[PDB]
Design a binder for this molecule. Sequence first.
Ligand code: SF4
Ligand SMILES: [Mg+2]
Ligand SMILES: [Mg+2]
Ligand SMILES: [Mg+2]
Ligand SMILES: [Mg+2]
Ligand SMILES: [Mg+2]
Ligand SMILES: [Mg+2]
Ligand SMILES: [Mg+2]
Ligand SMILES: [Mg+2]
Ligand SMILES: [Mg+2]
Ligand SMILES: [Mg+2]
Ligand SMILES: [Mg+2]
Ligand SMILES: [Mg+2]
Ligand SMILES: [Mg+2]
Ligand SMILES: [Mg+2]
Ligand SMILES: [Mg+2]
Ligand SMILES: [Mg+2]
Ligand SMILES: [Mg+2]
Ligand SMILES: [Mg+2]
Ligand SMILES: [Mg+2]
Ligand SMILES: [Mg+2]
Ligand SMILES: [Mg+2]
Ligand SMILES: [Mg+2]
Ligand SMILES: [Mg+2]
Ligand SMILES: [Mg+2]
Ligand SMILES: [Mg+2]
Ligand SMILES: [Mg+2]
Ligand SMILES: [Mg+2]
Ligand SMILES: [Mg+2]
Ligand SMILES: [Mg+2]
Ligand SMILES: [Mg+2]
Ligand SMILES: [Mg+2]
Ligand SMILES: [Mg+2]
Ligand SMILES: [Mg+2]
Ligand SMILES: [Mg+2]
Ligand SMILES: [Mg+2]
Ligand SMILES: [Mg+2]
Ligand SMILES: [Mg+2]
Ligand SMILES: [Mg+2]
Ligand SMILES: [Mg+2]
Ligand SMILES: [Mg+2]
Ligand SMILES: [Mg+2]
Ligand SMILES: [Mg+2]
Ligand SMILES: [Mg+2]
Ligand SMILES: [Mg+2]
Ligand SMILES: [Mg+2]
Ligand SMILES: [Mg+2]
Ligand SMILES: [Mg+2]
Ligand SMILES: [Mg+2]
Ligand SMILES: [Mg+2]
Ligand SMILES: [Mg+2]
Ligand SMILES: [Mg+2]
Ligand SMILES: [Mg+2]
Ligand SMILES: [Mg+2]
Ligand SMILES: [Mg+2]
Ligand SMILES: [Mg+2]
Ligand SMILES: [Mg+2]
Ligand SMILES: [Mg+2]
Ligand SMILES: [Mg+2]
Ligand SMILES: [Mg+2]
Ligand SMILES: [Mg+2]
Ligand SMILES: [Mg+2]
Ligand SMILES: [Mg+2]
Ligand SMILES: [Mg+2]
Ligand SMILES: [Mg+2]
Ligand SMILES: [Mg+2]
Ligand SMILES: [Mg+2]
Ligand SMILES: [Mg+2]
Ligand SMILES: [Mg+2]
Ligand SMILES: [Mg+2]
Ligand SMILES: [Mg+2]
Ligand SMILES: [Mg+2]
Ligand SMILES: [Mg+2]
Ligand SMILES: [Mg+2]
Ligand SMILES: [Mg+2]
Ligand SMILES: [Mg+2]
Ligand SMILES: [Mg+2]
Ligand SMILES: [Mg+2]
Ligand SMILES: [Mg+2]
Ligand SMILES: [Mg+2]
Ligand SMILES: [Mg+2]
Ligand SMILES: [Mg+2]
Ligand SMILES: [Mg+2]
Ligand SMILES: [Mg+2]
Ligand SMILES: [Mg+2]
Lengths: 122, 208, 99, 138, 137, 96, 82
Amino acid sequence: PTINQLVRKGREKVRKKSKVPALKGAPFRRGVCTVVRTVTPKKPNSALRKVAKVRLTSGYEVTAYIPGEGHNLQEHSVVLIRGGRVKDLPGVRYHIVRGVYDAAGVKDRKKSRSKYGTKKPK
Amino acid sequence: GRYIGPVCRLCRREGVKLYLKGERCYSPKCAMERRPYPPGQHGQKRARRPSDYAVRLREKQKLRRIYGISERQFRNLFEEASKKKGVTGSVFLGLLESRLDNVVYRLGFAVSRRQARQLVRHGHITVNGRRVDLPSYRVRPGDEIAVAEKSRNLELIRQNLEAMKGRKVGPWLSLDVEGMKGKFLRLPDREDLALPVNEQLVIEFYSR
Amino acid sequence: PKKVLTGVVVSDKMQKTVTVLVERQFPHPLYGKVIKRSKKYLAHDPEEKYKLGDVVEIIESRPISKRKRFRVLRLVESGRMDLVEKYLIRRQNYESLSK
Amino acid sequence: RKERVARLLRMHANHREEVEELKAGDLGAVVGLKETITGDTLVGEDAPRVILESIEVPEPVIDVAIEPKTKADQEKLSQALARLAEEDPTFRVSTHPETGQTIISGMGELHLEIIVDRLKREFKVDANVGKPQVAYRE
Amino acid sequence: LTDPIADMLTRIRNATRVYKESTDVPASRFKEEILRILAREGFIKGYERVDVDGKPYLRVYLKYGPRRQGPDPRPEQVIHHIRRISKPGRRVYVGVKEIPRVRRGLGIAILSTSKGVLTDREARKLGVGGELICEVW
Amino acid sequence: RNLSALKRHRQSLKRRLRNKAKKSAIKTLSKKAIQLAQEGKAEEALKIMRKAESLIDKAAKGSTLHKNAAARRKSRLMRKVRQLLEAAGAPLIGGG
Amino acid sequence: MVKIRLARFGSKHNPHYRIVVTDARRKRDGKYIEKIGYYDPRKTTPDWLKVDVERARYWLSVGAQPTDTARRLLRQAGVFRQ
RNA sequence: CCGAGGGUAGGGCCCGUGACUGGGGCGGUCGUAACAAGGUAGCUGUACCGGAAGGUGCGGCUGGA
RNA sequence: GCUAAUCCCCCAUGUGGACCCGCCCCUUGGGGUGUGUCCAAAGGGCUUUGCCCGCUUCCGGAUGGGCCCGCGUCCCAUCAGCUAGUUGGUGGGGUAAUGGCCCACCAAGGCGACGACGGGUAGCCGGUCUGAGAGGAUGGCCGGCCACAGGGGCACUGAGACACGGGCCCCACUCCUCGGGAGGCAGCAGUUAGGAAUCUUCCGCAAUGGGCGCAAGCCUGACGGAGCGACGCCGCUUGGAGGAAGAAGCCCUUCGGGGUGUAAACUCCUGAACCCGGGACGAAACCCCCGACGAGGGGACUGACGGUACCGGGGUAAUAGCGCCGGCCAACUCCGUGCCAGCAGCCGCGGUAAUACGGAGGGCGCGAGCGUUACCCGGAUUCACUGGGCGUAAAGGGCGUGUAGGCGGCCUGGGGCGUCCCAUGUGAAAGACCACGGCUCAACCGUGGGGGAGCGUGGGAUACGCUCAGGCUAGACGG
Ligand code: SF4
Ligand SMILES: [Mg+2]
Ligand SMILES: [Mg+2]
Ligand SMILES: [Mg+2]
Ligand SMILES: [Mg+2]
Ligand SMILES: [Mg+2]
Ligand SMILES: [Mg+2]
Ligand SMILES: [Mg+2]
Ligand SMILES: [Mg+2]
Ligand SMILES: [Mg+2]
Ligand SMILES: [Mg+2]
Ligand SMILES: [Mg+2]
Ligand SMILES: [Mg+2]
Ligand SMILES: [Mg+2]
Ligand SMILES: [Mg+2]
Ligand SMILES: [Mg+2]
Ligand SMILES: [Mg+2]
Ligand SMILES: [Mg+2]
Ligand SMILES: [Mg+2]
Ligand SMILES: [Mg+2]
Ligand SMILES: [Mg+2]
Ligand SMILES: [Mg+2]
Ligand SMILES: [Mg+2]
Ligand SMILES: [Mg+2]
Ligand SMILES: [Mg+2]
Ligand SMILES: [Mg+2]
Ligand SMILES: [Mg+2]
Ligand SMILES: [Mg+2]
Ligand SMILES: [Mg+2]
Ligand SMILES: [Mg+2]
Ligand SMILES: [Mg+2]
Ligand SMILES: [Mg+2]
Ligand SMILES: [Mg+2]
Ligand SMILES: [Mg+2]
Ligand SMILES: [Mg+2]
Ligand SMILES: [Mg+2]
Ligand SMILES: [Mg+2]
Ligand SMILES: [Mg+2]
Ligand SMILES: [Mg+2]
Ligand SMILES: [Mg+2]
Ligand SMILES: [Mg+2]
Ligand SMILES: [Mg+2]
Ligand SMILES: [Mg+2]
Ligand SMILES: [Mg+2]
Ligand SMILES: [Mg+2]
Ligand SMILES: [Mg+2]
Ligand SMILES: [Mg+2]
Ligand SMILES: [Mg+2]
Ligand SMILES: [Mg+2]
Ligand SMILES: [Mg+2]
Ligand SMILES: [Mg+2]
Ligand SMILES: [Mg+2]
Ligand SMILES: [Mg+2]
Ligand SMILES: [Mg+2]
Ligand SMILES: [Mg+2]
Ligand SMILES: [Mg+2]
Ligand SMILES: [Mg+2]
Ligand SMILES: [Mg+2]
Ligand SMILES: [Mg+2]
Ligand SMILES: [Mg+2]
Ligand SMILES: [Mg+2]
Ligand SMILES: [Mg+2]
Ligand SMILES: [Mg+2]
Ligand SMILES: [Mg+2]
Ligand SMILES: [Mg+2]
Ligand SMILES: [Mg+2]
Ligand SMILES: [Mg+2]
Ligand SMILES: [Mg+2]
Ligand SMILES: [Mg+2]
Ligand SMILES: [Mg+2]
Ligand SMILES: [Mg+2]
Ligand SMILES: [Mg+2]
Ligand SMILES: [Mg+2]
Ligand SMILES: [Mg+2]
Ligand SMILES: [Mg+2]
Ligand SMILES: [Mg+2]
Ligand SMILES: [Mg+2]
Ligand SMILES: [Mg+2]
Ligand SMILES: [Mg+2]
Ligand SMILES: [Mg+2]
Ligand SMILES: [Mg+2]
Ligand SMILES: [Mg+2]
Ligand SMILES: [Mg+2]
Ligand SMILES: [Mg+2]
Ligand SMILES: [Mg+2]
């Protein structure tokens, strides 16, 4: 583009699009579990991923992944969520934080216990 | 605090003898003399050609572990040398050398930096008269770094001073043995010290 | 100093007031080239001795009315209607640019 | 978690007296506490971090099903039957394994039919009540 | 034609990559002064005022390096690079402090100024600035 | 639940009275003289506009009027009276 | 009215005043008009006090008013000696 | 006189929501339109038509011979 | 209904000032001059034929403001037209003062593709974060300006307000006991609610600063300090030397062995914590005497932090955790599982021998932290000024004509607008940079130095761009 063109029109600045709108730009948001179930992931994977439907204090109602082996989350469970989508479950764009509110940490987790809210054993 | 752990495993991984014990480093009980290969289950396995990153990492931990210093304090220092004028490599090495717990060690008051550190910390070191117990004081040129004239009655200091009689010390240094005094004359030139570290590579490491 | 500007009368259709069209030039803050910006000042003509086309000078002055803060300093060139043409054509060009 | 006790209170018949101390074996109230719920343990900020015997023995012996009708105040039902499961620890909020509808478990008929209006008159929830459905087989 | 100066630099540029002995550019006292510098810095052997059908031109006699050994003997260039900075579409006007250093001194920069048509090494010593005409090396 | 600002207030109201009353007098006398100045009554006008001028300045002694406002107040008065008197002369006695 | 004042700098338990001229109603550490010296009350350096005698004289003359403990520092540096 | 605002009436913009509905994206039934001359060269603007891809008319393109 | 004054008014004096008109200088309402007119004032205190503290009018100073002008200041053109106090005039009101600020009348104008009007969003700057730089992003804490004080209107008093802790009125809410009244925490703490999340209902006026006062002094949630919180940065500790061809355990194993590992034990040395003693700097002024209440000299009172720091004597080996180990990317093996459970930032890994799941052993990385989420800049030369493209990758308008605009041949001259040069004013402080210095170091903090971009003013240069003037024929048009 000619320099004169640049003076007239100028360069369009690029705007970023929040991959996590439901957080209202918060680091985390609290919510309640309306539905807790399993959903099968897309190709080329095969499983029964544990997930939860959550109504946030932000007004949004999203579906949030439940990390680790085994959990205790049911309906009406109050739960904290964080950013990060699960690639294999479209529609899931948040993770439940283990060991906060009615969410327990993973029983008998030895490695990487902070990402699963397990306390250090004796 | 400091690394405060098993120190032989360090040398073995580095593949170079880092002198971190004093007396034993010269013994044939030195881990390096008996087992010059990396610690852990996979010590005696044919090496895999280390990546460029792999090099600069290990070349940095070398220099880092030698002085017994936190990655934080180390990094500020490096960064200080970059802001500083002229040669980043040398000046870094200089500032590293200028640390109190190091100078003390260079003048043989102790056999290890580790020991030297404790000497500074526990108080038994002074600077230009008045006591200084911080193992990080950038010693400037012109300083008298004696033993506490109130703590000279200690074998560990004595014996380590007993041996330091004739040793030719740093050109940047002078040592009044027996009277337990020591002076810091100049900051090192490049050649003045030989240590197993290609300083340029550390620079390349942080240049990533 | 009292700011002084050079411009052209493009309207004498007021009582004791003329409109002085002033051009200014400068390099573009990022793309460098010199570009023309302009502005219209309402100048005090207490004698109505200035008419369309008068290349005149106006001096920063004490307020005369709302957005009258310049008096005409002096004349520099008369009958520059060609410049009036440029300003006038464009203003008329706006009529097509509607919806 | 650490909590700031600010003032100390005693409740009388017709006034509250502010006090400076509550010795052992004595009772009163405390201002400044925010995270402490009933059944918890407080120790001096440098004291042995022990925990008293909680309590725990009676089991809810009446159970009733509640369904949010039509329909979307089951989320408005959830954060408000949460304000109460920690304060009136008696009643349980259970969802059945099979055909799972919500079963507000009370210690009694009146303990549920006075919780019935809490949800309906104070939490409003457009719902109607009845009985739990059975986990049948064939 | 819109920019004579660029054209001149270009007539030169085109001429060198085919190793022309000479090449003509239509005449202008300003093009002269620039060509004045080109010889004086040894980018060309020099120039001379000519005439083609009664039209004032300026013959520029190009300069190259020696022949070369190898698969490609085409001599090294004397003017490796020559490009306009200031343009009719966007004028470049450096002050003295901001006059660049062309290729670590190995090259020159030409600028038209209130004291004439100088180089960067030149305008610096005389302590001025002006229109950054072009850069050569 | 208390202060000495109410004291400041009680005082403010008392001052308002003195200020108002003064300004009243000024407007009353001024227009009055100007009116006589229009019919003229040349003598009685100037005769009045003096006690006007005085009271204008007397108020400016305090916080009632600012100096450069009374200055204005006095300016416009005389200009009004004189211009009026220009229709049907005989300006006697003295004031301006 | 225009004053001659100590404006605190330094830090916690490291006082370091700037003897200064500013409007009376100005914040203590706010924009002053001019600096005419400094003052280290702890006296931890050789010269813990320096007053531009010439300038303090100028302001003092025009109506600038020293604080009680401002003139002490000023007197001590002899702005009043004949 | 003006005046907070209250009221009456009629406009404008934006948000939320709505039985039903349009296609869109993501995770078995029918044919085989395109890719090899893909077994009717293909694509195309338009027009009409047909369960469906599509077919055909008129002109155009070669990114087909 | 009584009463004092530094409360209010009248008369006098008029240096002087204020106003009208005339003249003179000056040039927007600046400074003189004369005639006419108008205007001042307060007393108290002692050591008492005299000073202190106040009053009145005028002028100059100084500091703090008001108003005005140039240039700079985000997104949407799927907002393209906007405006009747609207634009100008005359007259008047108003103000400290200009102004359509307001009012009457008169004229019919004023603004807009250089983006008016409308919609969205936002307090602005010093700076801050990032970046090779250009740029981008950002305005928390500190400093400067603005705006607001439950939501709105209004004015009063005053040098100053249209006044957070002043007044009036309407609204909403709350609250005290049937007429009415009360409240305004976006002060310091604190409660409650919301939330992922943000503190003590602390100490002291000792310091500095503010208001009042002759002074003593009083007030001051400004402020100086204390408390809580790894929230951040910085410093320090959990030991130091010795100590087996190398215990036990656990892991691997070709059953020979290898690894944890000098690691531990154990030897000696040192001595965080704690214990005792001493114990601050910050504080010398205001005040008293001499001198003269001045200058100058002497002397006295005062510490919240705090019996804290720090100095000295004694003195116990005295917390370690978090992430990761397919590739990017540093760190590898056993078992368990068998497209299950699960991992995941991307490519992807799991279907019986998985360095990619889960445990273990070992290892790599940081270390009172380590990781995660969110956001900003970076890598993105992926909005390309620096510094990109457009035949087939995304991209030449279907083709002309032309408006605005951008751009433009050769020679000489005038001007000097850009451009360039020098001088000067500004560019506050803090910060940044370099230098030394103070807290034992560092963070933090002080003292000097360097100043720049921008704009104001003065002078200078004329090559290129501009403009004006005069000529040319290579562009372009015509015969
Ligand atoms: S002994 Fe040999 S191996 Fe062990 S630390 Fe000293 S040098 Fe490194
Ligand atoms: Mg798979
Ligand atoms: Mg529950
Ligand atoms: Mg360097
Ligand atoms: Mg870097
Ligand atoms: Mg007017
Ligand atoms: Mg709960
Ligand atoms: Mg009246
Ligand atoms: Mg008033
Ligand atoms: Mg007055
Ligand atoms: Mg402290
Ligand atoms: Mg109305
Ligand atoms: Mg209305
Ligand atoms: Mg009403
Ligand atoms: Mg609708
Ligand atoms: Mg639909
Ligand atoms: Mg076909
Ligand atoms: Mg087919
Ligand atoms: Mg076909
Ligand atoms: Mg076919
Ligand atoms: Mg085909
Ligand atoms: Mg067709
Ligand atoms: Mg059919
Ligand atoms: Mg058909
Ligand atoms: Mg055809
Ligand atoms: Mg009396
Ligand atoms: Mg009396
Ligand atoms: Mg009188
Ligand atoms: Mg009107
Ligand atoms: Mg007027
Ligand atoms: Mg108006
Ligand atoms: Mg007017
Ligand atoms: Mg404009
Ligand atoms: Mg808004
Ligand atoms: Mg806002
Ligand atoms: Mg601020
Ligand atoms: Mg308001
Ligand atoms: Mg409020
Ligand atoms: Mg209000
Ligand atoms: Mg107030
Ligand atoms: Mg108010
Ligand atoms: Mg206000
Ligand atoms: Mg308040
Ligand atoms: Mg209250
Ligand atoms: Mg508060
Ligand atoms: Mg605080
Ligand atoms: Mg005080
Ligand atoms: Mg005081
Ligand atoms: Mg207090
Ligand atoms: Mg504080
Ligand atoms: Mg801490
Ligand atoms: Mg730290
Ligand atoms: Mg062995
Ligand atoms: Mg073993
Ligand atoms: Mg073994
Ligand atoms: Mg050991
Ligand atoms: Mg000892
Ligand atoms: Mg001992
Ligand atoms: Mg002291
Ligand atoms: Mg005396
Ligand atoms: Mg003690
Ligand atoms: Mg000790
Ligand atoms: Mg030990
Ligand atoms: Mg990591
Ligand atoms: Mg890495
Ligand atoms: Mg690797
Ligand atoms: Mg993992
Ligand atoms: Mg397999
Ligand atoms: Mg396996
Ligand atoms: Mg594994
Ligand atoms: Mg992995
Ligand atoms: Mg980015
Ligand atoms: Mg970029
Ligand atoms: Mg870049
Ligand atoms: Mg470009
Ligand atoms: Mg294409
Ligand atoms: Mg085409
Ligand atoms: Mg044109
Ligand atoms: Mg030209
Ligand atoms: Mg032109
Ligand atoms: Mg110029
Ligand atoms: Mg500065
Ligand atoms: Mg120092
Ligand atoms: Mg400085
Ligand atoms: Mg001509």
